[PDB]
Design an enzyme around this catalytic site. Sequence first.
Site, PDB file in Angstrom:
ATOM      1  N   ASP A  83     -72.079 -70.490  24.202  1.00  0.00           N
ATOM      2  CA  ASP A  83     -71.943 -70.081  22.833  1.00  0.00           C
ATOM      3  C   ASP A  83     -71.619 -68.604  22.752  1.00  0.00           C
ATOM      4  OD1 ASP A  83     -72.377 -69.737  19.985  1.00  0.00           O
ATOM      5  OD2 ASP A  83     -73.269 -71.730  20.132  1.00  0.00           O
ATOM      6  N   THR A 120     -69.602 -72.021  15.399  1.00  0.00           N
ATOM      7  CA  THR A 120     -70.054 -72.900  16.445  1.00  0.00           C
ATOM      8  C   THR A 120     -69.736 -74.379  16.223  1.00  0.00           C
ATOM      9  OG1 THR A 120     -71.791 -71.332  16.970  1.00  0.00           O
ATOM     10  CG2 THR A 120     -72.064 -73.554  17.740  1.00  0.00           C
ATOM     11  N   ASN A 139     -70.097 -74.195   9.495  1.00  0.00           N
ATOM     12  CA  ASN A 139     -71.522 -74.353   9.752  1.00  0.00           C
ATOM     13  C   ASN A 139     -72.266 -74.822   8.480  1.00  0.00           C
ATOM     14  OD1 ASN A 139     -71.379 -73.764  12.511  1.00  0.00           O
ATOM     15  ND2 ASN A 139     -72.138 -71.670  12.288  1.00  0.00           N
ATOM     16  N   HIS A 196     -75.273 -61.485  18.645  1.00  0.00           N
ATOM     17  CA  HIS A 196     -75.559 -61.266  17.238  1.00  0.00           C
ATOM     18  C   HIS A 196     -76.516 -60.094  17.030  1.00  0.00           C
ATOM     19  CE1 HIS A 196     -73.685 -64.434  14.928  1.00  0.00           C
ATOM     20  NE2 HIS A 196     -74.089 -65.337  15.794  1.00  0.00           N
ATOM     21  N   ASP A 206     -67.061 -71.518  22.732  1.00  0.00           N
ATOM     22  CA  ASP A 206     -66.610 -71.931  21.420  1.00  0.00           C
ATOM     23  C   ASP A 206     -65.847 -70.871  20.672  1.00  0.00           C
ATOM     24  OD1 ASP A 206     -69.057 -70.517  21.244  1.00  0.00           O
ATOM     25  OD2 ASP A 206     -69.958 -72.074  20.036  1.00  0.00           O
ATOM     26  N   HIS A 207     -66.215 -69.611  20.885  1.00  0.00           N
ATOM     27  CA  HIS A 207     -65.639 -68.472  20.182  1.00  0.00           C
ATOM     28  C   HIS A 207     -66.225 -67.192  20.774  1.00  0.00           C
ATOM     29  CE1 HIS A 207     -69.523 -67.867  18.464  1.00  0.00           C
ATOM     30  NE2 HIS A 207     -69.518 -69.113  18.033  1.00  0.00           N
ATOM     31  N   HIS A 267     -69.176 -63.621  14.094  1.00  0.00           N
ATOM     32  CA  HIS A 267     -67.926 -64.285  14.392  1.00  0.00           C
ATOM     33  C   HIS A 267     -67.679 -65.252  13.243  1.00  0.00           C
ATOM     34  CE1 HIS A 267     -70.455 -67.742  15.337  1.00  0.00           C
ATOM     35  NE2 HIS A 267     -71.242 -66.848  15.893  1.00  0.00           N
ATOM     36  N   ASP A 288     -50.980 -80.829   3.914  1.00  0.00           N
ATOM     37  CA  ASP A 288     -51.555 -81.558   5.050  1.00  0.00           C
ATOM     38  C   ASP A 288     -50.941 -81.142   6.394  1.00  0.00           C
ATOM     39  OD1 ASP A 288     -49.112 -82.835   4.874  1.00  0.00           O
ATOM     40  OD2 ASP A 288     -49.937 -84.837   4.723  1.00  0.00           O
ATOM     41  N   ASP A 327     -43.211 -83.242   3.765  1.00  0.00           N
ATOM     42  CA  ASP A 327     -43.328 -84.051   2.560  1.00  0.00           C
ATOM     43  C   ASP A 327     -42.230 -85.058   2.526  1.00  0.00           C
ATOM     44  OD1 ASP A 327     -45.482 -82.532   1.769  1.00  0.00           O
ATOM     45  OD2 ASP A 327     -44.418 -81.622   0.060  1.00  0.00           O
TER      46      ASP A 327
HETATM   47  C1  LIG Z   1     -54.106 -83.717  13.353  1.00  0.00           C
HETATM   48  O1  LIG Z   1     -54.314 -84.984  13.968  1.00  0.00           O
HETATM   49  C2  LIG Z   1     -54.740 -85.998  13.090  1.00  0.00           C
HETATM   50  C3  LIG Z   1     -55.043 -87.267  13.889  1.00  0.00           C
HETATM   51  O2  LIG Z   1     -53.874 -87.735  14.539  1.00  0.00           O
HETATM   52  C4  LIG Z   1     -53.671 -86.220  12.034  1.00  0.00           C
HETATM   53  O3  LIG Z   1     -54.291 -86.947  11.011  1.00  0.00           O
HETATM   54  C5  LIG Z   1     -53.811 -88.271  10.906  1.00  0.00           C
HETATM   55  O4  LIG Z   1     -52.662 -88.252  10.104  1.00  0.00           O
HETATM   56  C6  LIG Z   1     -52.062 -89.530   9.957  1.00  0.00           C
HETATM   57  C7  LIG Z   1     -50.737 -89.328   9.225  1.00  0.00           C
HETATM   58  O5  LIG Z   1     -51.037 -88.840   7.907  1.00  0.00           O
HETATM   59  C8  LIG Z   1     -53.042 -90.476   9.254  1.00  0.00           C
HETATM   60  O6  LIG Z   1     -52.421 -91.747   9.374  1.00  0.00           O
HETATM   61  C9  LIG Z   1     -51.937 -92.226   8.124  1.00  0.00           C
HETATM   62  O7  LIG Z   1     -53.045 -92.670   7.340  1.00  0.00           O
HETATM   63  C10 LIG Z   1     -52.628 -93.052   6.028  1.00  0.00           C
HETATM   64  C11 LIG Z   1     -53.855 -93.215   5.104  1.00  0.00           C
HETATM   65  O8  LIG Z   1     -54.909 -93.999   5.690  1.00  0.00           O
HETATM   66  C12 LIG Z   1     -51.717 -94.284   6.149  1.00  0.00           C
HETATM   67  O9  LIG Z   1     -51.144 -94.562   4.869  1.00  0.00           O
HETATM   68  C13 LIG Z   1     -50.547 -94.087   7.131  1.00  0.00           C
HETATM   69  O10 LIG Z   1     -49.959 -95.358   7.441  1.00  0.00           O
HETATM   70  C14 LIG Z   1     -50.910 -93.327   8.412  1.00  0.00           C
HETATM   71  O11 LIG Z   1     -51.398 -94.201   9.441  1.00  0.00           O
HETATM   72  C15 LIG Z   1     -54.408 -90.525   9.960  1.00  0.00           C
HETATM   73  O12 LIG Z   1     -55.456 -91.082   9.153  1.00  0.00           O
HETATM   74  C16 LIG Z   1     -54.917 -89.139  10.292  1.00  0.00           C
HETATM   75  N1  LIG Z   1     -56.036 -89.141  11.256  1.00  0.00           N
HETATM   76  C17 LIG Z   1     -57.162 -88.385  11.138  1.00  0.00           C
HETATM   77  C18 LIG Z   1     -57.391 -87.546   9.927  1.00  0.00           C
HETATM   78  O13 LIG Z   1     -58.047 -88.374  11.975  1.00  0.00           O
HETATM   79  C19 LIG Z   1     -53.227 -84.927  11.393  1.00  0.00           C
HETATM   80  O14 LIG Z   1     -52.104 -85.186  10.562  1.00  0.00           O
HETATM   81  C20 LIG Z   1     -52.896 -83.874  12.449  1.00  0.00           C
HETATM   82  N2  LIG Z   1     -52.619 -82.637  11.779  1.00  0.00           N
HETATM   83  C21 LIG Z   1     -51.497 -81.949  11.947  1.00  0.00           C
HETATM   84  C22 LIG Z   1     -51.373 -80.743  11.115  1.00  0.00           C
HETATM   85  O15 LIG Z   1     -50.599 -82.303  12.681  1.00  0.00           O
HETATM   86  O1  LIG Z   2     -76.294 -78.728  22.875  1.00  0.00           O
HETATM   87  C1  LIG Z   2     -75.487 -78.684  21.936  1.00  0.00           C
HETATM   88  O2  LIG Z   2     -74.093 -79.144  22.133  1.00  0.00           O
HETATM   89  C2  LIG Z   2     -73.203 -78.952  23.276  1.00  0.00           C
HETATM   90  C3  LIG Z   2     -71.768 -79.431  23.061  1.00  0.00           C
HETATM   91  C4  LIG Z   2     -70.733 -79.150  23.972  1.00  0.00           C
HETATM   92  C5  LIG Z   2     -69.425 -79.584  23.693  1.00  0.00           C
HETATM   93 CL1  LIG Z   2     -68.010 -79.313  24.731  1.00  0.00          CL
HETATM   94  C6  LIG Z   2     -69.124 -80.274  22.546  1.00  0.00           C
HETATM   95  C7  LIG Z   2     -70.143 -80.528  21.671  1.00  0.00           C
HETATM   96 CL2  LIG Z   2     -69.757 -81.381  20.183  1.00  0.00          CL
HETATM   97  C8  LIG Z   2     -71.443 -80.120  21.894  1.00  0.00           C
HETATM   98  N1  LIG Z   2     -75.856 -78.265  20.705  1.00  0.00           N
HETATM   99  C9  LIG Z   2     -74.885 -77.831  19.693  1.00  0.00           C
HETATM  100  C10 LIG Z   2     -75.553 -77.010  18.577  1.00  0.00           C
HETATM  101  N2  LIG Z   2     -76.600 -76.086  19.092  1.00  0.00           N
HETATM  102  C11 LIG Z   2     -77.355 -75.308  18.062  1.00  0.00           C
HETATM  103  C12 LIG Z   2     -76.539 -74.742  16.894  1.00  0.00           C
HETATM  104  C13 LIG Z   2     -77.260 -73.617  16.099  1.00  0.00           C
HETATM  105  O3  LIG Z   2     -78.562 -73.309  16.614  1.00  0.00           O
HETATM  106  C14 LIG Z   2     -76.437 -72.367  16.041  1.00  0.00           C
HETATM  107  C15 LIG Z   2     -75.909 -71.800  17.222  1.00  0.00           C
HETATM  108  C16 LIG Z   2     -75.115 -70.651  17.212  1.00  0.00           C
HETATM  109  C17 LIG Z   2     -74.859 -70.039  15.996  1.00  0.00           C
HETATM  110  N3  LIG Z   2     -74.179 -68.959  15.603  1.00  0.00           N
HETATM  111  C18 LIG Z   2     -74.294 -68.873  14.272  1.00  0.00           C
HETATM  112  O4  LIG Z   2     -73.740 -67.939  13.617  1.00  0.00           O
HETATM  113  O5  LIG Z   2     -75.042 -69.866  13.701  1.00  0.00           O
HETATM  114  C19 LIG Z   2     -75.404 -70.602  14.741  1.00  0.00           C
HETATM  115  C20 LIG Z   2     -76.186 -71.760  14.795  1.00  0.00           C
HETATM  116  C21 LIG Z   2     -77.582 -76.768  19.988  1.00  0.00           C
HETATM  117  C22 LIG Z   2     -77.255 -78.230  20.274  1.00  0.00           C
HETATM  118 CA   LIG Z   3     -47.149 -82.604   3.416  1.00  0.00          CA
HETATM  119 ZN   LIG Z   4     -71.032 -70.563  18.660  1.00  0.00          ZN
HETATM  120 ZN   LIG Z   5     -73.152 -67.128  16.458  1.00  0.00          ZN
END
Ligand SMILES: *[C@@H]1O[C@H](CO)[C@@H](O[C@@H]2O[C@H](CO)[C@@H](O[C@@H]3O[C@H](CO)[C@@H](O)[C@H](O)[C@@H]3O)[C@H](O)[C@H]2NC(C)=O)[C@H](O)[C@H]1NC(C)=O
Ligand SMILES: O=C(OCc1cc(Cl)cc(Cl)c1)N1CCN(CC[C@@H](O)c2ccc3[nH]c(=O)oc3c2)CC1
Ligand SMILES: [Ca+2]
Ligand SMILES: [Zn+2]
Ligand SMILES: [Zn+2]
Length: 772
Positions: A112, A150, A171, A256, A299-300, A405, A656, A660
Amino acid sequence: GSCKGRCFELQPDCRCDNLCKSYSSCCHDFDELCLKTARGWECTKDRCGEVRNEENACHCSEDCLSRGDCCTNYQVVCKGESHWVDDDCEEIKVPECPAGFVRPPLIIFSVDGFRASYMKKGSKVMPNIEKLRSCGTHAPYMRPVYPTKTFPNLYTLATGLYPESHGIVGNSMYDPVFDASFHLRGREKFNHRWWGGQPLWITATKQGVRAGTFFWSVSIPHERRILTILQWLSLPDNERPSVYAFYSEQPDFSGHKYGPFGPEMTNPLREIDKTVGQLMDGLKQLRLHRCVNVIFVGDHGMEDVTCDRTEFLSNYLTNVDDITLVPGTLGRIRAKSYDPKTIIAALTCKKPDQHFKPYMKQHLPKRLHYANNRRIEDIHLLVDRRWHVARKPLDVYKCFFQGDHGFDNKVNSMQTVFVGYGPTFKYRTKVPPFENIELYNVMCDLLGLKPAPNNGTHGSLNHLLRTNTFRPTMPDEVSRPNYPGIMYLQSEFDLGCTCDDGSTKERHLLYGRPAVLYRTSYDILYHTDFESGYSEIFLMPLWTSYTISKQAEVSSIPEHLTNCVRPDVRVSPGFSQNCLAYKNDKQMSYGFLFPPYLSSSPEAKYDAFLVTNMVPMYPAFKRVWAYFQRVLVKKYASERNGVNVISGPIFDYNYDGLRDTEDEIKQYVEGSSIPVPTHYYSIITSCLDFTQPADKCDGPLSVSSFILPHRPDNDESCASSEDESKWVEELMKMHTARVRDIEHLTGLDFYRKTSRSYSEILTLKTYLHTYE
Ligand SMILES: *[C@@H]1O[C@H](CO)[C@@H](O[C@@H]2O[C@H](CO)[C@@H](O[C@@H]3O[C@H](CO)[C@@H](O)[C@H](O)[C@@H]3O)[C@H](O)[C@H]2NC(C)=O)[C@H](O)[C@H]1NC(C)=O
Ligand SMILES: O=C(OCc1cc(Cl)cc(Cl)c1)N1CCN(CC[C@@H](O)c2ccc3[nH]c(=O)oc3c2)CC1
Ligand SMILES: [Ca+2]
Ligand SMILES: [Zn+2]
Ligand SMILES: [Zn+2]
Ligand SMILES: CC(C)CCC[C@@H](C)[C@H]1CC[C@H]2[C@@H]3[C@H](O)C=C4C[C@@H](O)CC[C@]4(C)[C@H]3CC[C@]12C
Ligand code: NA
Ligand code: NA
């Protein structure tokens, strides 16, 4: 009712898994049996050969290897082995796993708030990490998603999705459909309703690959998390997970409190390295240290932010009690129980030093991809690095923090780390920086999994891996172009326009024609100075391509042509714009995609005034575009030894990030069917080897791109009253973009005909020029 023989089991009856604490559903004996700490976490010489005592945290007995619960340093202290960190890198050409392992495990070691630049501190502070980084594959930095918080980032890592797509857009969030708020503290976050997409552990489970837990209760010490992972790895083949995650709250916590540059930051980094050492020692003990792929990822990053650098909405808004503000390193504003236009106006360029900028979310830089979710408030504040925004002076408490951050993800201090080490990653290899949205695909590749659809560009990170189970394929063109000749006369045109009047491809289209990936009708139009792909549906180019040499000459638009628009005799009157529409539309003017300023001769300049090269432009926007065209294109050509420019319109009325349909266009030039773009893009390409001109380049390309918002005012640019040389370029850098972002917004596919591999081109398309 008991944890006996079930501590950290992988599956209201009481639980013994690593999250039972967070649901407060641990069995009565969970702490006594599963959280032993007696004698700590390191064998010492006197403990070697001890009789097992079931109260010890870990064991130094002869039997401990058969049990898979030795302390991580047992072989070193008790069998004269060396620490993993003391051995030289040896290239891992193939996985060396026990038989009955069907794929190499993956351990994701996430840290983190690990700023990229913390890697500069070296093997004195972090010898284990520095070795992982040296011997494995690393990037100089990895770009997080916006906001650089995070949960949005970890969930992005897990899913490959922008926050707007996975749903964890902060968050803290309010979902109006649920009428509820998600926060770091509280039970609401445990509800599955918040989490979209398909995270890695689910992708794995669905494809028959077992996952360890990816979340650790803060109660579980780091050393115990490592021992648990190592114990799980010693499970029989039918139970053993293939993917594991460890998480460290450091160095974020310390960052922090002391800020990123404190001398007090060394101890947290030493502790993280010690934890890495225990894992790698533990792996070596189990002979899995040349079997497991290990990802060290953050993460950042972390920035210097103190409560003294806080802007207060109460100094802009006349009543802050009518608004709810999600505060800090970003701002999100909505109504408490109020008028948006008034609010934006009151927050716009009101102080000379103003350290945030309001945006309607659809006007945020497209590269942020931070609009298309009902959880993202319409009103957004981009906060300058080093600063916070808050509702009123009373909301700052005295400072408790020196680092934070959440800022714009192109900010240096927000960048984080990536190291990949193991059989599947390359040996002693540096790779360019990349975005964390790309990792999910890689993790799937590493595990033999089919990624769920996501926002990575699958193939763009093939150059990280020794072995690729995924070969990208160039998408097929959907629409073939037409190549119209002369087939209409001047006198057939009734456009209300007025004017006082085949080696094009070699020169102006250096990387092949862009493929149109949707069904439409369009025309390839050739001229001396530029080529274009002219849409009969949208009545303008989808793209216009041209090459400007280092030595190109900029000329003016002569007075007699100021208002010149000429009909294009290759294209029907019925598929052309008309000048009357612009005369009638009081708010709308027009510009040109290929700039008349860069005509090769006075004769050629006439081509630039063709109606097929014209696009709708607000006068406000024309200030920006004219500067880009008249001054910056020449500047870039002069700096880069020539450039190739592809420009065109984008329509994204529903914000999106996707082109379009006609149906989704909400604005047209008055009385016409001429759609108004929401944005204008340009892609500017030259030779990475700048000793070669853009048009005679043998090697890697160099690209920078932008997606400029097509705005009727320049309220975004607080210095726009000044000369364009004081603000337009700043505007452009803020709206820097990846080619891939343009591809999604246009339905076009670029760089189809180069001498580069397609995976190299995918890397090129994912590049973002950041200007830091
Ligand atoms: C980032 O990736 C996500 C996941 O691939 C993209 O979102 C996905 O976008 C498609 C196209 O809009 C969605 O599929 C469509 O859903 C609609 C409504 O249910 C349907 O009418 C269409 O036939 C089509 O299958 C899909 O739900 C959606 N998936 C998500 C949100 O998880 C997204 O567009 C990508 N973003 C960028 C900026 O490329
Ligand atoms: O073990 C974990 O996940 C590991 C993981 C790895 C991978 Cl690659 C993917 C995923 Cl999906 C998850 N946990 C995630 C959240 N964590 C506390 C968050 C909380 O205490 C917090 C922490 C930092 C912060 N900075 C801030 O400004 O506010 C904050 C709040 C503990 C449990
Ligand atoms: Ca669009
Ligand atoms: Zn973090
Ligand atoms: Zn933090
Ligand atoms: C100490 C705290 C910070 C720990 C909080 C962890 C919490 C956010 C975790 C625990 C369980 C997780 C969910 C679980 O894996 C199942 C799914 C299925 C998947 O398709 C969507 C994600 C989701 C809901 C997980 C989200 C993260 C959860 C709630
Ligand atoms: Na007009
Ligand atoms: Na302005």
